[PDB]
Every structure is written in C-alpha cells, then in structure tokens.
Design a binder for this molecule. Structure first.
Ligand SMILES: [Mg+2]
Ligand SMILES: [Mg+2]
Ligand SMILES: [Mg+2]
Ligand SMILES: [Mg+2]
Ligand SMILES: [Mg+2]
Ligand SMILES: [Mg+2]
Ligand SMILES: [Mg+2]
Ligand SMILES: [Mg+2]
Ligand SMILES: [Mg+2]
Ligand SMILES: [Mg+2]
Ligand SMILES: [Mg+2]
Ligand SMILES: [Mg+2]
Ligand SMILES: [Mg+2]
Ligand SMILES: [Mg+2]
Ligand SMILES: [Mg+2]
Ligand SMILES: [Mg+2]
Ligand SMILES: [Mg+2]
Ligand SMILES: [Mg+2]
Ligand SMILES: [Mg+2]
Ligand SMILES: [Mg+2]
Ligand SMILES: [Mg+2]
Ligand SMILES: [Mg+2]
Ligand SMILES: [Mg+2]
Ligand SMILES: [Mg+2]
Ligand SMILES: [Mg+2]
Ligand SMILES: [Mg+2]
Ligand SMILES: [Mg+2]
Ligand SMILES: [Mg+2]
Lengths: 213, 159, 168, 175
RNA sequence: GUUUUAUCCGGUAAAGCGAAUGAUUAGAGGUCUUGGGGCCGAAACGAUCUCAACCUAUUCUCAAACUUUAAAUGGGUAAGAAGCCCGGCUCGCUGGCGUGGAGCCGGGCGUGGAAUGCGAGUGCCUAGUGGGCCACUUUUGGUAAGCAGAACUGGCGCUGCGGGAUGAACCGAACGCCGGGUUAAGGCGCCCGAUGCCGACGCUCAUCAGACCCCAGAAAAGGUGUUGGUUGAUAUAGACAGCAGGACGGUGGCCAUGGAAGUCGGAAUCCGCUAAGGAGUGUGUAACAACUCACCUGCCGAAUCAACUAGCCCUGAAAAUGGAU
RNA sequence: CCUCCCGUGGAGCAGAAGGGCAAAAGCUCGCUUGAUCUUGAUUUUCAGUACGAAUACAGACCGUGAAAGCGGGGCCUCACGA
RNA sequence: CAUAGCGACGUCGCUUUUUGAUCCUUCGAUGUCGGCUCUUCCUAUCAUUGUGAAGCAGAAUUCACCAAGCGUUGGAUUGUU
RNA sequence: GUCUACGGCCAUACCACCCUGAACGCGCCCGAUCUCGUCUGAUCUCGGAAGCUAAGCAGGGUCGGGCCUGGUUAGUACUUGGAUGGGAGACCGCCUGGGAAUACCGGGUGCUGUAGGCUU
C-alpha cells in the first residue's frame, strides 16, 4: 500500500506543507513525540544524548514512529519506565504526493499516462539537514551506555547515516552541563518542569526582589 | 501562460515598508522638479493614481514635462535587443531626486572653483579622480611586541 | 617590518583558448587585448584593472615582471602599432615618430616608461602590439586550475618571470 | 594545494589601519607550503578562519622561509592535525623521524595520502613539535631509539634491470 | 555583453517563529467558569483535591502561494564644452514682488574633469529560418526515465583536428598549402610515439582483485584480514590470557504457587564473614538438585584490555550466444 | 438594547486574490450628476499594429465645499469586440 | 527460546520471465497470438551427486552450500498463454 | 531654561505607572441672550473669566516593555567564478572574491525650522 521509501528519500521538491492549498492530507503516522517521565525536573535527568543526521534527506513519519517505538522499548527495558525522557525533534510537515496509475492489464483504460500528472497527497515526511537532531534522550548520568545502545538500535529504522552524540548541555536545556549548577546557584536559571527559565539582569527590580526572597 | 495584468507580480514591489504605512509625508509634494533633472522612479502603492508600470520601478530618467501633479520622464527601457527611450507620466509621489546627479554637479562646481583658485595661485592641481592606487611602501612597528602566533583549532562536534 | 610598495605593473598572459568563453570573460579579454592564447600584455595595476583581472582569472596567468623580463620582452618580441600595422621595433625612429611628443624616443625610454609606470604609460603601452609568445618550453603544470592549487591560472606573484623566460 | 618538498614559512600579517584602530595587532603563523605564493594564500585562509580578516581588508607584512636550526640531527616530530574524511572530520596525532621540520611535514602529507586517501586540501596542520625520544608514542618511531641499532638488508632487489636487458647470469639478492 | 567611483532599485538564498499570519510538541505557574467533579464536601463543594477550558512566562518543530531582518550575483543613472559662470531681452503662462518658469541674444572660461579598449554614424534592398537538441549550474511535474517543461552561458546542428579504445554534445583546441621548434588535454610494460628513471613514501592478496571527468554498473549492513587514529580502563600494592579453588549465612529473602528455592513473572538490593559472592549473568532440574557466570584468591612474572573511527581488501553481489580495465 | 474602558485596524471597502487606506479609501448624513461635450500626447500587450484598459494634460460646461481644492465613473490590478 | 524454522513496525537493494511510464529506431511494411518441431543458454536447484543445520531417535520433512552434468512425463476441458 | 501658533523628519518622539511645574501661555472652568448644532450647550458653536494645575500638557524617574544604534552570533549561514576535486549517491571539501539574521550582551530615549511670549 505504501511505496518504498527510496522513492521519496531525497529532498527534490520545495516544501509542501499541509495548508489551505494542500487539502486532503492523511494523518501522519507519528502522533506522540515525547515519552518517558516527561514531568521529570531539570536536575533529575542531567545527561542528554542526541542522534544526529549526516545526510540531507527526508525521513518518513512511519520511520519516525518505528524508531520512537524501538528506542522506547529498549529504554523501558534497560532504565525502567520512569528513568528516561525521549523527545523526537522532527515533525513530518512535508507532504509527498503520488500520481496513481491503474495496476491492471490496460493502458487504454483512461490511464492518460503523464497527462495531468500532479498527484494526490501520499503521505508526510520530515526534512532533516546535515547536523540536525532527530531524537533526544535525557536520563541519569549512569545510563549513558543504555542511551547509546537505544539510539544505535533506533538508527536501523532510518535510511541514511546517523551519528550518536552525548551533548555537553544539561538535559534538554541549551546551557552547558558544567556551567549549569553555578548558574542555578546564582539564580541565572530557575527550573520549571522539564526546562529552565533564563533570568537576565534586566527588567524591573520587583522581579529581582521576588527572587532572593 | 502568464496573465498580462498591469500589476501582476507587484505584491511586494508596490507594498509599503514595515511600519511606514498611512499618510504620505508632505516633503515629497514640496519637492521641486525642473525640466532636465534626473529622477528615480519608485512607485509607492499608497497613491494609486499616476502609478508607473512595474518595469519602471527602480529605473532612472530625465524630466521633460511638468504638470500640476505629475512629471513627464524620459526613461530608457530595454526590449529584446534594443533600448528605446520611453516617455511616461508619473505623479510626484512615485519619484525623487537622484543623488548621483547632485553629487556630480557639486563636484563640477568644486572643480571649477579649484581651477579658479589654482589659476589665481599659480600652482597646478589634480582634478581627474584616479582609481584606488596600489598601497605604498611603509614601515610596520612591532612596538616591542612579538606578533601573536595563530594555529587552527581542533575539530569537535557541537550540535 | 618594512612592507614594500604594492607592485604597480603586471604582465598578463592568456593561457586558455578561444572556444566556449562566457561573454563577460570574452569582453574583458578583448579589453586587455588578449584575443589569442599565449598573448601577453603589460597592465598597470589599480582597483579597476585588478577587478578586471579577477573576472578573467581562470583564463590568464599574470604576475609582476622584473626589469630583465621587461627588457627581454621589449627587445626580442617588441612590436609597435604604427598606422594600425604590426611593425617590428628595429629602429629608434619608429618609436620617436609615434611617441616623441611624449618624450619617448628610444627603446630605453619605452622600457623605462613600461617598468616605472610613468605619466604616459597608457600611450607607451598601447603603442606596443600585444606580445605573441611561444608555448612554454617545459610544459605547464595544469592550465585548468589556479596557481596556488598546483595549476597555472591566476596570480603568481613573481614567478611570472620564470614563466616568461620559458614562454619567449 | 599540491605539494613537492614543502618549506616552512613564517608569515606575519595584520588588518589595514582604520580610524577605529590605528595599530591593529600583528599575527604570525607557520605555513608549510611549496612556495611563498601558496604560503600567503594559506595564511589568508587560516586567519580568515580564526580571526575576522580578509586578504582585501588586511595585508601581509612578512613572509620568510624558516630554515631548520639543526638539519644535521635526527629528531622526532609530533604533528597534531585535523582532516576531513569521506564521512566526517577527525583530529590526529602522528609521529615521524626526520632531519627537517618541513621534511617531517612532507612525510606527514604523503603518509596521510597513503593511509587515509586524504588530499592536501583536506589536511589542516595545527601543531608541529620536536619531541624527546621518551615522549614518543608510535612504536614504528620508538623502535629506532636504540643506541646499538643493527639490522641487515635482507633481500636486495636488482634495480638495474635493463642495464643489461639481456644477460647470461641470474642476479644475486644476498649481499 | 568590462571594471572603478558615486547613487538609487529588489525580497531570492539564508534566517525568524520567547515578531505578525498560518502550522505545531511538551511540561510549568495562576485563578474565573453550564469542564468533568469530589473520595467524609448537599448543609455557605462546611472544605479543597484532581482533570479540563482560559491566561502568563517558557519550550520542540515548520512554510512555493508567511514574515521583522536580509545577502552574493543582478538592473537603472551619472562621471561636462549640448558643461560651468556672467550680463541682457521676450512671454498672451505664473504672479504681493524687479515673482517663478521657459525661451532667446551677447560674453568669458579646455587641467577635454575615472580605468581600459576600439574608428564611428546612417540608409536601402534582402535570402534562409520560424521541428531543434545537448552539458555545468538554477529549476517545475513525475517513483523514475537516453521522460516532459523553463532560466543562464556555452556547444552540436553548421565543425574538422589532439585525447576519452569506440561515440553529434565530454576535455584540449577551432582549420589556407608546408618546414622547424614547443605545448594543451591526455599519456609513456607491448599493441602504440613516449619513464630501458638504479624515481620517492606508504596501502593492498581478492577460489567474482583493482585500474582515471561525462561513462557505461551497485546499497544498507557486517569482518578477531590488515593499516592508521580517538576516547577510556587495568597493571611489580603484580595486570591480560591460561590452569586450580571459594562463589556463603540468615534466605528454600517478600507478592506471585500446583514446583519454582537466585534464574516461567512484580517490586525493591538487607546486613555480617571476609578473599569475595548478584537475596543473581546463563544452562537446567517436574521440582529439589547439579553446573556456569561477576567477585576474590592461588600458580604464572611484563605489559595489557575495551568501545569507537576510516583507508585498502573480503561478505552482502543472481540471467540468459562466448567476452571484455 | 443602553453605558463606560481597552482596542494599529485583528473590521469594512460589490465579487477571486494581492496591494492600499483611520478626524481614511470605511460608516452616516447633505447637496448633486465629472458615468457629460471635445482635440491631441502617453502607458500597458506590443511588431513598439489594433482593441480593451489606464495615466498626465489642454479647451468647454457643470457639481461640491467657506476655501484650498477634488471630480470627467467605481481605491488599484479583470469585467470585453474589426 | 528473538534469530531450528519464521519476521511486525521500519529500512537497503537486485531482476527485466509481469504490468505500466516514455515515444529514441521502424509507417516507399521487421508478417501480429497460441500450439507443434528443434537447438542452445541462464540459475533465483524440483530431482539426482557431495555436504552443513534442525524443534535431525529411525522414516519422512524442512533450512542452507558447492553445483545447471543429467532429467523434469502421459492425458480430460479450453484457440488459449 | 522653557512655552504658544504653524510645521519638517515621523517612536531616540510610542506605551504603562510615579514625582515635580516659578512666570507668560496652553488648558481645565462658568454660562446659553445672540451665531450654530444636538435625545442631551456632553461634543460643536457662541459670550465670558469665579476657581484650579486635579487632568491634558511640559520636564524628570523605572536593573520598565517597545523603538533606535552597536557587540556577539560569525568570516558562521548563504553565495559569483574554477577544477579530469572527493563520494555509489545524498552531498561535502578546496581555490577565487563577496558576506548575513535570531537568541544573548551593551549604550541611547527626539532633533529641528519660521513667527511670537515668559523667565533679574
Ligand atoms: Mg517492489
Ligand atoms: Mg519536483
Ligand atoms: Mg573547452
Ligand atoms: Mg623537449
Ligand atoms: Mg517573488
Ligand atoms: Mg528559506
Ligand atoms: Mg509564528
Ligand atoms: Mg516550435
Ligand atoms: Mg528536456
Ligand atoms: Mg538541420
Ligand atoms: Mg556557428
Ligand atoms: Mg568543433
Ligand atoms: Mg578523437
Ligand atoms: Mg571509454
Ligand atoms: Mg571546463
Ligand atoms: Mg609541426
Ligand atoms: Mg594510450
Ligand atoms: Mg614504444
Ligand atoms: Mg566489492
Ligand atoms: Mg477640465
Ligand atoms: Mg480611479
Ligand atoms: Mg520529445
Ligand atoms: Mg519483408
Ligand atoms: Mg524477416
Ligand atoms: Mg546458486
Ligand atoms: Mg552436455
Ligand atoms: Mg528598556
Ligand atoms: Mg567562498
């Protein structure tokens, strides 16, 4: 029912989002993008490991769903259901089309060949660049090998080449792990849920004195 | 297969800049345009009357006729392998004085003054502007400071 | 550190042929009077001429000639454009009758005005027919790439003299 | 960048003075290049990467060859470099033995081309340093640190295979 | 069919979405409501617990028909004698004004007001053509096409010659008839001109090796083949590998049961003995049992181990007449 | 329905979309017929032919406004015929 | 008991024995289906030879390797493939 | 040092809140006979001058939002021209020139024309 992904591997078209011009798009295969203990605080999961593409290509929503399921199963097996938090960082926004031909023994049957060849929406894929992050897993610092193995197993659900990278940031934040603790101590960062709020040294002094109090 | 409407493809060309909509400032009306002076045709979209065609946006021409609200401009247009001097009527909202002509006439007046002054004081002076000459010989002092040694940095994957 | 003056004279040699040339490159080569492969011309260096050389960089090899290179080029292959004709410079009267009004009356004056880029450099240089040099004896490295990447095109600083010795 | 027998060049440059800093800083690099033209080009490449400089906005105040201060002494060279493979960029530390620093860098370029198919435009030499024989880490270099080194030349191949081209006697490989 | 110096023009590439318009992920903090409701609140949900919606500050990801910002390349104009500067005259237009504007008439100023190159201007008559195709790059439709359709330049058509064995288009170079010299792209075992150099350094063994733009065949995934490199770890307080032992007590630990006793599952990982021992890495017993592992020790006395990474080689790798670096 | 406050337009301008517009070009009133009579020039498609449409003028006769002014159809890009 | 034998979600290929897509050759013509006859070739091996594996006790079967030497039939219906 | 009238550029000028305002002025303010408009003398129009700076307005303030301008991001992204460069490709590196934009970190918070007043 679905064409091989090699037919839609490369970014050959302009982006074709689901909009008021592209109507009738079927839903993407991936609906859930965050798994594990999403409610875990920032300091709970210091280690962050990403899986990073090396090819400018298109990843299908079915491939993202399969990789998410595989990584979730391995992480639940190894670190337990509350010991990790995974975030898929690719959303299938690019609609791929199909010019369907009649798969019978006849070309006279109104096939028309390449006339009016613009196709109906086949599905959705995500566009990934060289260096872009596909999946992220944050967890305790001692589950580094489990994160690496989960991402390695998830790599097999994707066409191109991917690298595993243990990032230097603290968890899913954009701040370095070595500089995270002192920044929180001096209140440049305030935890809220899975992320932190950066508090710059500007604004009203009332927001400063609600801190330090 | 393209339409031939007068304003096809002018969606951004005739749109106003960001946060510069509304009333047209009155200095644009207060400008003075004589015959023979050089104007740039722009074509703002706030004023829909007397608009230039999109092929004259960004062009520069010479004023030959002045009316109550517009001017007549002789502007070169290239059509296939020939350039022809078109004459267009454009309201003054869509034009402004070209500063290249102003700078050139200021240079001419300054050069004439230089000729007069140099003929008064005898000594010759250079008027033709020369292109950027090669740099001349000079000494670069170290000031007792050894130049900093630079080496390429090792690769690391960032994000 | 003493930084010398940037060289004000260049020798430009056209190293690629006349087949399949983009219009801008073709126009700039015609303006440099390099309408044939292995044609050489003295170019006075400024911003305009340097940018013109940058346009036609893949098609030329150029550099900074020295006094010996100027002497060899003018004496062995020097031809004047007298009455639109390519006349060999076998006498000083041929130079005097065309350039005497500028104070240039001999081969030495022509060489001086070319080497030290003088007031009448444009007249003295346009008097000279573009030099028709032979193939480089000993071969080139690679005419299709730049000099800095192992080839022959573009600006070699003062190795143009090594090129000239083999070229004429 | 092609090659040959590379030479070391000390290249010193600086930005052109502007009415923002009348005396911009001077920067010095060691460039291993076939000649001074390529050396200046590589200097501009590297300082464009490191600082925010261009050949047009700056100038080169010095470019002089650096002669080896002891070409009659065998010494160990460690070279820190980085290069682009077919599938990424890697940092390498390699060791060689040579009389000259430039000869060691040439050995490095040939060895990278031989072992990793790395062309010279992919390789960025970032540090060259003479190292003590106790600081060496590569066993192929360390095995020559013998005060009583001794080896024969076992199987000496005839190289004059065409003078004579035809002969009655078969060659000897033992000497 | 050019640059330079001035001066405008633009909304593409990129970027942005804690900026508008659309799309979209997740938590966090607040408190109103036809949200569910909530366990003891009817009684004034006496209460305040949860989930909604909403708001606020954040957060993940996007746009050919979105955008604050915004290139490179690009398009226009100017770089004087038809100019500049003095007087004067005409006007039925304009008008407080001898105003303004335009025109006209005299006169004076050449350092000829960037670079470079080139000799230009102009008229008449006019054939053939009006099926095109190809390549780099940009690009639309299509799974794709030696497919269909555009932009830019060059080419083939109209074109031979040197190289790619061969070839409309690739690379070099364009051509009167010749002699000598030298090259390009490409080559120099032999075919076949030229390495018959005492060429340099490495890599590689293929029982389908490999061998040069277009180009004429391959992928994911693997290898304890070999070669380099990165990070980490152990080791004379004796590593590693081999050979030989211990591998418990409570506890045949709890909830699982028809036996699961460490190992058909769910939770947590207690302590002492110390040389160590997981209330367990596996085999298994109907079940016990019996083995094994990670952990320590003994003998052994100098280095070793692991995970990656990427070069060549190998596996992956199957078609029809006998055959093609 | 009535009242206050906020409200850069997130409404409306006949219609498709895009542009434009706030004491506007929107809404409501008042007066009106410039949607009138004419000649040329010009722009758009372009061969620089036509039609259509449009822009700036000039000459009449009017409308409105205290007036400056604005108006010869519709805010602009289509709505047509030798 | 993942991997004796299988393989969801994904994903990489090969083939030209299917059918398409295209319209480069042929419209001053390349006789257009099937069968009969006859030869040769391929291997992605049904059997036979020699092996490896099994949830291979034997028997039978299944998976895989070297492998195309040799063989792969008689009939009812249908123009049939 | 300021204000008024008319402005030019149109946020460095806007927005929110707080403080101060001498003198002229600008305002608020008082009234409806006339002029003129309303459902309403609220607005508009007209005639004034008891009181007031409460508001408008002006100046200043806010680790203020915005806006303006710098640094960083970053010689990064992107890009003109080149190669018989790499790679099965996807794409990538180099040569030759040009070169950004967020986040983040600083500084600033109207300038000015004409005419006429006030300020010992
Ligand atoms: Mg298939
Ligand atoms: Mg497409
Ligand atoms: Mg060519
Ligand atoms: Mg020779
Ligand atoms: Mg556009
Ligand atoms: Mg974009
Ligand atoms: Mg948005
Ligand atoms: Mg046609
Ligand atoms: Mg085509
Ligand atoms: Mg033909
Ligand atoms: Mg031709
Ligand atoms: Mg030809
Ligand atoms: Mg040939
Ligand atoms: Mg071939
Ligand atoms: Mg080429
Ligand atoms: Mg010859
Ligand atoms: Mg050959
Ligand atoms: Mg031979
Ligand atoms: Mg192979
Ligand atoms: Mg009229
Ligand atoms: Mg109108
Ligand atoms: Mg066709
Ligand atoms: Mg026949
Ligand atoms: Mg026949
Ligand atoms: Mg087989
Ligand atoms: Mg046989
Ligand atoms: Mg602020
Ligand atoms: Mg570049």
């Amino acid at each position: 029912g679905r064409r091989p992904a090699r037919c839609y591997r490369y970014c050959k078209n302009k982006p074709y989002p689901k909009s008021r011009f592209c109507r009738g798009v079927p839903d993407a295969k991936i609906r859930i993008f965050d798994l594990g203990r999403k409610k875990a605080k920032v300091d709970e999961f210091p280690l962050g490991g990403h899986m990073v593409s090396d090819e400018y290509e298109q990843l299908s929503s079915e491939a993202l769903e399969a990789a998410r399921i595989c990584a979730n199963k391995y992480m639940v097996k190894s670190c337990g259901r509350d010991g990790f938090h995974m975030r898929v960082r690719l959303h299938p926004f690019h609609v791929i089309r199909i010019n369907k031909m009649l798969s019978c023994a006849g070309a006279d049957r109104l096939q028309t060949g390449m006339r009016g060849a613009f196709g109906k929406p086949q599905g959705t894929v995500a566009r990934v660049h060289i260096g872009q992050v596909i999946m992220s897993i944050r967890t305790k610092l001692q589950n580094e090998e489990h994160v690496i193995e989960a991402l390695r197993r998830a790599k097999f659900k994707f066409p191109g080449r991917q690298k595993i990278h243990i990032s230097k940031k603290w968890g899913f934040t954009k701040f370095n792990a070595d500089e995270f603790e002192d920044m929180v101590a001096k209140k440049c960062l305030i935890p809220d849920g899975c992320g932190v709020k950066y508090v710059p040294s500007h604004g009203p002094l009332d927001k400063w004195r609600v801190l330090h109090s | 297969t393209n339409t031939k409407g007068k304003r096809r493809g002018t969606r951004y060309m005739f749109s106003r800049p960001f946060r510069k909509h509304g009333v047209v400032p009155l200095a644009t009306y207060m400008r003075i345009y004589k015959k023979g002076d050089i104007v740039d045709i722009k074509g703002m979209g706030t004023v829909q009357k007397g608009m230039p065609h999109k092929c004259y946006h960004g062009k520069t021409g010479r004023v030959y006729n002045v009316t109550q609200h517009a001017v007549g401009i002789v502007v070169n247009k290239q059509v296939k392998g020939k350039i022809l001097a078109k004459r267009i009527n454009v309201r003054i909202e869509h034009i402004k004085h070209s500063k290249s002509r102003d700078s050139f006439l200021k240079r001419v007046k300054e050069n004439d003054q230089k000729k007069k002054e140099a003929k008064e004081k005898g000594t010759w002076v250079q008027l033709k502007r020369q292109p950027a000459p090669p740099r001349e010989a000079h000494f670069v002092r170290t000031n007792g400071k050894e130049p900093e040694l630079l080496e390429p940095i090792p690769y690391e994957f960032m994000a | 550190f003493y930084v010398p003056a940037e060289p004000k004279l260049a020798f430009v040699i056209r190293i690629r042929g006349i087949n399949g040339v983009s219009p801008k490159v073709r126009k700039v080569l015609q303006l440099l009077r390099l309408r044939q492969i292995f044609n050489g011309t003295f170019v006075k260096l400024n911003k305009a001429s340097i940018n013109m050389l940058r346009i036609v960089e893949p098609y030329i090899a150029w550099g900074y000639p020295n006094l010996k290179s100027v002497n060899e080029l003018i004496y062995k292959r020097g031809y004047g454009k007298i009455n639109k004709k390519r006349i060999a410079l076998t006498d000083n009267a041929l130079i005097a009758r065309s350039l005497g009004k500028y104070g240039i009356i001999c081969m030495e004056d022509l060489i001086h005005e070319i080497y030290t880029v003088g007031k009448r450099f444009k007249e003295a240089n346009n008097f000279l027919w573009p030099f028709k040099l032979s193939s480089p004896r000993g071969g080139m490295k690679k005419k299709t790439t730049h000099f800095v990447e192992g080839g022959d095109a573009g600006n070699r600083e003062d190795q143009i003299n090594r090129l000239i010795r083999r070229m004429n | 960048k092609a090659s040959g027998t590379l030479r070391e060049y000390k290249v010193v440059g600086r930005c052109l003075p502007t009415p923002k800093c009348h005396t911009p800083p001077l920067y010095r690099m060691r460039i291993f290049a076939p000649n001074h033209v390529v050396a200046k080009s590589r200097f501009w490449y590297f300082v464009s990467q490191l600082k925010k400089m261009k050949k047009s906005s700056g100038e080169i105040v010095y470019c002089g060859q650096v002669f080896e201060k002891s070409p009659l002494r065998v010494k160990n060279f460690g070279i820190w470099l980085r290069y682009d493979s077919r599938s990424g960029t890697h940092n390498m530390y390699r060791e060689y033995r040579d009389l000259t620093t430039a000869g060691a860098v040439t050995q490095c370029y040939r060895d990278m081309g031989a072992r990793h198919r790395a062309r010279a435009h992919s390789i960025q030499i970032m540090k060259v340093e003479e190292i003590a024989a106790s600081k060496c880490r590569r066993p192929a270099v360390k095995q020559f640190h013998d005060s009583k080194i001794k080896f024969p030349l076992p199987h000496r191949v005839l190289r004059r295979q065409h003078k004579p081209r035809f002969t009655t006697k078969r060659p000897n490989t033992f000497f």
